[model samples]
Target: SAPLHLGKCNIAGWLLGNPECEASSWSYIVETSSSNNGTCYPGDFINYEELREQLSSVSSFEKFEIFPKTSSWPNHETNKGVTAACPHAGTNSFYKNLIWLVKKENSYPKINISYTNNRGKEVLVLWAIHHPPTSTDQQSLYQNANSYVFVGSSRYSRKFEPEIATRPKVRGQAGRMNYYWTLVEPGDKITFEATGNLVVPRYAFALKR
Candidate 1:
């Protein structure tokens, strides 16, 4: 049960006019047992400052498309040759993965987790969100992860981050996700998605609804 951890984007005070919102500072706290000068370990609060510093080193590896988790190259490509997105685009690890930005400084990032349940060998799909309002808090619908349990938490989730959706790229694509019926149909008799719903209701729900 090792952890899947993320360093902070440290978009912390920068978006709030604090001048520190650059993605360079997203850092995490290391665990004291195996800690790196107080960086957060599994199930620990990330040192916002440290995480950002680490992220600045991530240019070599794109975290990978947290969503779809597919091999589709277009999904990650920010744009075509004419007007490409930040280099990290198609390589995966898109920063704006599952975010609901309230503002530049304050915001929420979301991602889904898929894993194999050790006990039953069942594959579980989960939802994860980072609320940075109050010193950063992360919430997940996974039976496995919880608030401050996994991933990063922002400081704005305490109140509201006042996020403004980033403009859709590639001719303003809107980034609207649609039903995958064209890809699969419900009760299609397939082992994986026989429960195939263009809109597969996630196994979990949020109180925010």
Candidate 2:
């Protein structure tokens, strides 16, 4: 893993925009590192109590959640039940950008990142993982809405709404990997709102001045 530039603030301070976001697993920011990777196969499992304590801490985000009380859909047999920490995550997953937590046993299209910025440089980027959203509802608490990760110049309370945004780039490779790019001064903001059965690792670092 390349060293993230401008490591001025500690992990907690950085989340509030003091500096760049930490290059670490959201679960392991205070907990132990993840021990599962398709390429790595690896940590101590985070118990329910420790996880709850971490969740209540200031380091975590207020608007996002791995297990939202508003939905009973996750309790269905199809998902096997979700927790504060997902079972498929790696301690330091290299698969940044939009990523899907689809089980290999269940067949689904491979998600990737593609772009066409002939108009000008795009300040913010948007993309979905796994399958395309076909829901018609837009209500925040409704299960049909909110299922994508967003990278932008500011914060958004709604899932589909974003400023400095694009229609989502959808062309790239299928596996987890990296690409070379430069950093934008000042940095950018990012957030994730999981309103469905989707488990996308929402993260930040858009590089804007």
Candidate 3:
């Protein structure tokens, strides 16, 4: 099983080694499966940089902020009170200005397409981080909507699934968003679903595992 990590506190500051910030990191082994058209290998079929460019090109309404896999996470202290403070933590603006952190090797989700079986089935394997605004005032600013993940090309064949996995595991009353995750068993098919707009941190990319 592949391990998925969820940051329950101030993920941004925690990554930068802030003494007051903590990740409250939760890790789980998510089960994943792929067809036998080819052996699993490690390499970037589509790297994070390229993925961001493609996503940007296609999405006319949404703007994405793609950060490097190794770049330091955005500092929450700098963006307090503004929408930019927590790009992935809001309602209406959640998708708008989403902070897209490129997945590092063995850290992010992956997708693979095969040449056989009608260009091969696209298997997406990745974890999502759901973060809604913490305070009641902030949460009241917007209404919750379901988040989605889409696979396939063109309108006829595309599939958009709600990205829901686990319930919220409240870390601290002062943290950013409540967080938790469920596991995907080995050889199991991965589904793309999320219940609320808070599930904004969806990582979809092409990589072979």
Candidate 4:
């Protein structure tokens, strides 16, 4: 059976606000895949103490936090999700300091903008997720914490959405946010993938004149 081969490792790290990972500043990208395929392959530039021994040899993994502490501007009808409608937003505006934040729960990351769109086409649009204030075993681990948006080969433009805030009543914990807006145009080979757990923050994009 040469068809049960799965192996993928894509790890890029740099989440620095001065925590000492070589004078870290801010950067993150983690992906590990291998259910059997080809025994696995893909490696280079892995720091942070070798990243937990390369994530214990992988089987399935995720982590995405390229950047984004707060650049504000996300509330397009309660956080947004599952989009791709001819790029229309008060005259195309999306570049809020390059947002990217995915905080755990099967972290998924695969972002490459190609040096800001190689000086031309660019339009990922947006995708947001932020959920907190869950007690009771973290609300059953977010009930699956749904959040995903793949563009440029996850087997063709995938966008599975759910969870846009609002699920915390008893005593109020406080923490909710959601956003999604797809306009995928992976020209120049733009790639971006995401999973869930809350805290995407804003994996936005723009520039398509």
lDDT tens digits by residue: candidate 1, 27-109: 23232233121211111222444534433322122112223323312212222111111123233221222222121112222
- For each candidate, the alpha-carbon lDDT, in order, equals 0.21, 0.27, 0.26, 0.31
Arranged by lDDT, best first: 4, 2, 3, 1
TM per model? Answer: 0.20, 0.21, 0.24, 0.23
The TM-score that candidate 2 achieves is 0.21
- In angstroms, the error of model 3 at 209 is 4.8
Q: List candidate 1 segments past 4 Å from native.
A: 1-46, 69-95, 99-209
Best model number under lDDT: 4
lDDT of 2 by residue, 13-99 (tens): 232221122332233333324322211111112133442343332322222222222342232222322222222243323223323
Candidate 3 shows a clash count of 8
Candidate 2 worst ten-residue window by lDDT: 37-46
- Worst 10-residue lDDT window, candidate 1: 190-199
Best by TM-score: 3
- What tens-digit string does per-residue lDDT give for candidate 3 at 6-121? 23322222222122222111133222353121101111122343433322221111112222222323221111122333323232112212232322322233222211112122
Give the count of colliding residue pairs in each prediction.
47, 3, 8, 17
lDDT of 4 by residue, 1-209 (tens): 11211123222111211011111111223334542211011111123344334322333222223234332322211122211211224232222322323333432333333112332333433333435444432334333344454444322354544334445442232444333333334444434544443323233333332
Order of models, best TM-score first? 3, 4, 2, 1
Q: Candidate 4: list runs displaced more than 4 Å.
A: 1-18, 22-69, 72-116, 119-145, 149-195, 198-209
Model 1, C-alpha of 154: deviation from truth (Å): 22
